[PDB]
Amino acid sequence: SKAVPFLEAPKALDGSLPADVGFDPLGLSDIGFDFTYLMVPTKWDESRTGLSALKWFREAEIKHGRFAMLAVLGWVAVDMGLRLPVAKYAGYNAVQAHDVFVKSGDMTVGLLAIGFLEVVMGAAIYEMSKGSDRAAGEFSFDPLGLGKDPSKYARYQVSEIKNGRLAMLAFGGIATQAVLTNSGF
Amino acid sequence: VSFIKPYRQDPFVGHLATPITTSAFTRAYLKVLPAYRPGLTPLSRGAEIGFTHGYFLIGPFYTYGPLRSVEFSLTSLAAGLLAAITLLLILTVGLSIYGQVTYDVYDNALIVKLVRQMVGSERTQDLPQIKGTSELDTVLGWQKFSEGFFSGGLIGSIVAAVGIALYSTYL
Amino acid sequence: ERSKSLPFLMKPKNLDGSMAGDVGFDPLGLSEINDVGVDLYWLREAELKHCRLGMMAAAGILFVEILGPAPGFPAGKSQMDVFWKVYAEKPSLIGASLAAIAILEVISGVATTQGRQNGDRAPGDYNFDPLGFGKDPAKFKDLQLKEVKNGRLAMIAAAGMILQGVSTHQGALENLS
Amino acid sequence: LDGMIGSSAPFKNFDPLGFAAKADQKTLNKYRESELKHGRVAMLAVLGWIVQEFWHPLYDGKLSSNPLKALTEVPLIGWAQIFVAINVIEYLQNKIKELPGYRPGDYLGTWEWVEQSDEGWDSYQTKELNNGRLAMVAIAGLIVQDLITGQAALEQITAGNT
Amino acid sequence: IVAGHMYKTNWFLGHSIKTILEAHKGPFTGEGHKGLYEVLTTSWHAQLAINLALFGSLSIIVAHHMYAMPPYPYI
Ligand code: CLA
Ligand code: CLA
Ligand SMILES: C/C(C=C=C1C(C)(C)C[C@H](O)C[C@@]1(C)O)=C/C=C/C(C)=C/C=C/C=C(C)/C=C/C=C(/C=C/[C@@]12O[C@]1(C)C[C@@H](O)CC2(C)C)CO
Ligand SMILES: CC(/C=C/C=C(C)/C=C/[C@@]12O[C@]1(C)C[C@@H](O)CC2(C)C)=C\C=C\C=C(C)\C=C\C=C(C)\C=C\[C@@]12O[C@]1(C)C[C@@H](O)CC2(C)C
Ligand SMILES: CC(/C=C/C=C(C)/C=C/[C@@]12O[C@]1(C)C[C@@H](O)CC2(C)C)=C\C=C\C=C(C)\C=C\C=C(C)\C=C\[C@@]12O[C@]1(C)C[C@@H](O)CC2(C)C
């Protein structure tokens, strides 16, 4: 491997996935369970060859990274003010805004909307398991167009996954610390 | 695996080799019983059977008889003992008449071979036929079996009465 | 091969291009259902009926809230609560409307099943063009697209108005401001 | 440590101290007999420990629910009958052991029907052996805990003496 | 309602009663429940036997639970 040199490799981390360095001490990328069956419990389709656990984990990692990046942006925003131009959003930090907004019937709306988007893109994941050429985390979302020049696309890929790992860990710290750089415990 | 098979590889017998008919536990348990224990004369088999049977027969008569006693009574024990002994006498009478009407043999495991070898052109059912080769299947064998049953029944009933008296007195 | 609406999804097999408003938005593959008497024909007929019902309901709510009720009818600006005021004073009107809608819906279901069986009637077609606004082709497709888009928007709008009236117990434009 | 039944996934042919690498077939049969008897007795002992703790209908209540205390409260004439019954059972087992084709722990005589054993039969025998081993460990722990602490299983757990 | 989503009818979802029965063999029971699905799908009398026996048992259970826990006012 290129990290943890005293372990050769998991088994499936050949390098076909971006941002691959070989770091997987527990060998989690070799579970034979096709996690698409957590969505569609049965084979359903006779053409459902199956999805490798590594590809499902890559999709989950990309989704986690995007969620964590947006989450740290939002949590940092509400520490330095920046409230929505509307009533009922006064100042109630981030450690308490979640509960008060769950009370005020709009976190349920956010849950519904996020679930709608998640269901559509999980249908995308299921089609990938069925055998579509779509790669993990690829929703073909390039509106501004900074995704051409394949070298730039690969660099931005590795950038997104590394930034997502950093943002996951940073959000874990921020939520655990209740923020120290911009507020108090 | 299958734990039920035809008995002794004969699919036409009215029997089966179940985990109860032909289990090792069944084999050993029935081979340690007096009726089938090897090395016992018919008198010994009868004596052991009578001892056990009188021993457990005195129980119900003494406990639930017409002369019970929640405390220990010599009259209750005597009544139970007499009832058990008379029941053993009735059983011995039944054994005697059964043996009288069933067998006509004095030495088995031979007559069968003699009539399978030296021919049996007679009235049959004594020379030929002969069900069972055990020593219990003879006139002499069953007579000694009944005698042993009767004597052992008396002795076992007396022993059980003594034990009941000791348990009721010293406990 | 990829759906026009969702580029990360393959083209839904049963939705080629024919129906107005078709952009390939069938992430769950519901167009491939062929059971319990439900298929693409039944789904399209249900969608068109929903579109028309939502258009009528949204137009009615907006009309009553803006221009007020007709003479002799109750007011209140809450369309989800004024229904009980109409029923409290004119129950026969509500009952007759319900009976008429029931008969028309029985006819609609019979027509849907028949047209599905001996294919001669497009889904949602009831030969209702008294003013001849869609006689010629090359305008019928445009009118179908307009109807489908307006009906989907009015479906969403009418569901929103129903939920707002049930929860807030206030008018639609009252909730707006 | 042979083709014997009882080898499971966590530690296949578990003989770290090499007790079986030098023993002959007779000693290994003795070891299997001892293991199976210990396992069965321990399963009975664990079940009795728990059930006695939360249910002792016999002896008109009394007979304190803590084991190792009811051990010294049974009339001691019921102890004799249990002892004699166990003795007669093991006499019968000894008589079984001389039957032809006897297998170490097989007192049902399954060798009469089971020639060319399947994988289900071996798996069930391994299940019995593993449950017996777990029950041996559990009953050893039960007795030791009750000795050192003085409380029974469900009593020590309920209080929180862990 | 939950129990009604058990058997496979028209989708790749649910159970096949044939596969359930045929898998329930044993050392003491030979082939087990193999062929019972064919018996109960080709004989009305077998279905009537099972249904009538369980139906009478259910009627007796109903009779017991009726007086045991009176379910009607002033009954
Ligand atoms: C993980 C993402 C995430 C989540 C869950 C939240 C959650 C919240 N934010 Mg928030 N925020 C985020 C990221 C996030 N933020 C980011 C990245 C920014 C910077 C741009 C902000 C800036 C921000 C401000 C300025 C304010 C909030 C506020 C709030 C709170 C009120 C909103 C509410 O009740 O739910 C409403 C429902 C949701 C938030 C669910 C999101 C559903 C979206 C809208 C669907 C569409 C997503 C979008 C299209 C994604 C595109 C990707 C793909 C389609 C291509 C709530 C706790 C307000 C507050 O009072 O907080 C204390 C407030 O004033 N946030
Ligand atoms: C090693 C096994 C073992 C031993 C030594 C004891 C010992 C004791 N138990 Mg006990 N018990 C056991 C297992 C055991 N138990 C199991 C497995 C159960 C669950 C059914 C119970 C349930 C139980 C209750 C409910 C009670 C006792 C009680 C008692 C005490 C009085 C004796 C009595 O009445 O027993 C009664 C025993 C039984 C009713 C069940 C015994 C069934 C045996 C163990 C299985 C068959 C044995 C068979 C003859 C030999 C195996 C054949 C083959 C494998 C070779 C005494 C300390 C009593 C007491 O005072 O509690 C404090 C009491 O009320 N036990
Ligand atoms: C078998 C069948 C028909 C058929 C067939 C045939 C005949 C065999 C022919 C074919 O061959 C096959 C088939 C299947 O088509 C089935 C019939 C259909 C059903 C089962 C009818 C259901 C209609 C229910 C509706 C549409 C009710 C809506 C309720 C509303 C309430 C309105 C409110 O204002 C109220 C009252 C209170 C207010 O506070 C607020 C709200 C809540 C908004 C909105 O409107
Ligand atoms: C532990 C953790 C991450 C641990 C990472 C580790 C050890 C990584 C170690 C390594 O990298 C190094 C060091 C070096 C590498 O070479 C080797 C490895 C091994 C790779 C994240 C926790 C992450 C923990 C998280 C994210 C917990 C979040 C909790 C939240 C957000 C709570 C939200 C609330 O809603 C509630 C629940 C209630 C509301 O009332 C209030 C609020 C607060 C709003
Ligand atoms: C069903 C109906 C009304 C139903 C109303 C109901 C149930 C309401 C009931 C309630 O309010 C009450 C009572 C009391 C409340 O407490 C309870 C409810 C339940 C709220 C009206 C039909 C009304 C039906 C009408 C008006 C029919 C008119 C028919 C015409 C003109 C026919 C013409 C032709 O027959 C000729 C002449 C020649 C033919 O060849 C051609 C044609 C054209 C077909």
CA distance C15 to C22: 7
Contacts of B106 (CB under 8 A, 6+ apart): B138, B139, B140
Q: Would you list the DSSP string of chain C?
A: -B-SS-TTSBPPTT-SS-STT-S---TT-GGG--BTTBSHHHHHHHHHHHHHHHHHHHHHHHHHHHH-PPTTS---S-HHHHHHHHHHH-HHHHHHHHHHHHHHHHHHHHHHHHHHHS--S-TT-----TT-TT-STTTHHHHHHHHHHHHHHHHHHHHHHHHHHHHH-S-HHHHH-
Amino acid B104 reads D
CA of A169 to the centre of ligand 4 (A): 6
Of the residues A4, A61, A101, A176, which should be mutated to test ligand 4's pocket, given the most ligand atoms within 8 Å of the CB?
A: A176
In 3D space, the residue among B52, B40, B63 whose CA is nearest the CA of residue B153 turns out to be: B52
- The answer, yes or no, to whether any atom of ligand 4 lies below 6 A from the CB of A175, is yes
User: How many whole angstroms separate alpha carbon D118 and alpha carbon C29?
Assistant: 47
Q: What are the phi and psi torsion angles at C170 (to 5°)?
A: -135, 170
Closest CA relative to residue C26, chosen from A37, A38, A127:
A127
Residues 6 or more apart in contact with residue A60 via CB below 8 angstroms: none
> For atom 29 of ligand 2, which residue has the closest CA?
D52
Q: Phi, psi (5° rounding) for residue E30?
A: 60, -125
Output the six-digit token pair for A19: 């941002």
Sign of CA dihedral A146, A152, A157, A158: negative
- 3-state DSSP assignment of residue D74: coil
Residue numbers in B near E30 (CB within 8 A): 2, 4
The binding-site residues of ligand 5, defined as CB within 6 angstroms of any ligand atom, are C 91-92, 94-96, 99
Cα A82–chain centre separation: 25
Distance CA B155, CA B88 (A): 11
Q: Indicate if the alpha-carbon torsion angle B104, B108, B109, B113 is positive or negative.
A: negative
User: CA-CA distance, B150 to B53, in Å (whole number)?
Assistant: 10
Q: Give the pair of three-digit tokens for residue B42.
A: 């018919």
Q: How many CA atoms lie within 13 A of C33 on its CB side?
A: 15
Q: Classify burial at B32, counting beta carbons within 10 Å of its beta carbon; exposed 0-12, middle 13-18, buried 19 or more.
A: middle
What b-and-e string marks burial along C29-60, b requiring 16 or more CB atoms within 10 Å of the CB? Answer: bebeeeeeeebbbbbbbebbbbbbebbebbee
Interface of B with E in 2-21 (CB under 8 A): 2-4, 19
Distance from first CA to last CA of chain C, Å, rounded?
A: 45
Nearest chain B CA: its distance from D98 CA (Å): 9
The helix or strand, by DSSP H or E, that contains position B132, with its residue range, turns out to be none
Residue with tokens 């052996």: D129
The data reach a resolution, in angstroms, of 2.8
What is residue A19's DSSP assignment?
Answer: T
> In sequence order, what are the residues at sequence separation of 6 or more whose Cβ sits closer than 8 angstroms to the Cβ of residue A129?
A34, A36, A40, A48, A49, A50, A51
Helix, strand, coil tally for chain A in percent (to 5)? 50, 0, 50
Q: How far apart are CA D2 and CA D11, in angstroms?
A: 13
Alpha carbon of E30: minimum distance to chain B alpha carbons (Å): 7
Q: How far apart are CA C27 and CA B107, in angstroms?
A: 95
Pull the structure tokens for residue B44: 């010994």
Which chain B residues contact residue D77 at CB under 8 A? 171
CB neighbours of residue B48 within 10 Å: 19
CA atoms within 13 A on the CB side of C100: 6
**Residues in chain A within 8 Å Cβ distance of E5:** none
Q: How far apart are CA D153 and CA A64, in angstroms?
A: 45
- Residue C44 and residue C171 in contact, taking contact as beta carbons nearer than 8 Å: no
d(CA A27, CA C173): 59
Q: How far is CA B39 from CA B42, B49, B147, D97, in A?
A: 10, 15, 19, 19
Pairing of strands B5-6, B16-17: antiparallel
Ligand 2 center to residue D52 CA distance, Å?
A: 8
* Radius of gyration, CA atoms only, chain B: 21
Element (H, E) at B6: strand B5-6
Question: Terminus-to-terminus CA distance in chain A, angstroms?
Answer: 40
Residue D127 alpha carbon to ligand 2 centre in Å: 23
Largest CA distance in chain B: 68
The response to whether residue A178 sits with its C-beta less than 6 Å from ligand 4 reads no
Q: Is the CB of A90 under 6 A from ligand 1?
A: no
Both tokens of B75, joined, read 């009259």
- Answer whether A106's CB lies under 8 Å from A113's CB: no
Chains C and A touching, counted as 3 or more CB pairs less than 8 Å apart: yes
For residues A50 and B117, give the distance between their C-alpha atoms in angstroms, rounded to a whole number: 79
Is the CB–ligand 2 distance for residue D84 below 6 Å? no
d(CA D105, CA D122): 13
Give the CA-trace dihedral at B107, B112, B114, B119, to 10 degrees.
140
Beta bridge partners of E5: none
**Which residues in E lie closer than 8 A to residue B3 (C-beta atoms)?**
27-28
Distances (CA, A) of A154 to A42, A95, C8: 35, 37, 19
Q: How many angstroms separate the Cα of A185 from the Cα of each of A94, A95, A177, C40, D141?
A: 12, 10, 6, 57, 45
What are the two backbone dihedrals, phi and then psi, of residue A118, each rounded to the nearest 5 degrees?
-65, -40
E7 phi/psi in degrees, rounded to 5: -100, 140
Helix, strand and coil percent figures for chain B, each rounded to 5: 60, 0, 35
Which residue bears the tokens 């008296």?
Answer: B165
All chains having 3 or more CB pairs closer than 8 angstroms to chain B: D, E
The answer to whether residues D152 and D65 touch, using CB atoms and an 8 Å cutoff, is: yes
Structure tokens of C152? Answer: 């989907």
What residues of chain B lie within 8 A of the CB of D113, using their CB? 1-5, 17, 19
| Ligand 3 atom closest to the CA of C108, numbered from 1 | 15
**Residue A137 class from Cβ within 10 Å (0-12 exposed, 13-18 middle, 19+ buried)?**
buried
Query: Which two three-digit tokens encode residue E60?
Result: 């007796």
Our CA dihedral for B140, B145, B150, B154, rounded to 10 degrees, sits at 130
Which three-class secondary structure state does DSSP give residue B5? strand
Helices (H), chain E: 17-22, 36-42, 44-68
Phi/psi zone of residue C38: left (φ > 0), alpha (ψ -120 to 50 degrees), beta? beta
Residues 6+ apart with CB under 8 A from E2: none
Question: Alpha-carbon distance D137 to B147, whole Å?
Answer: 55
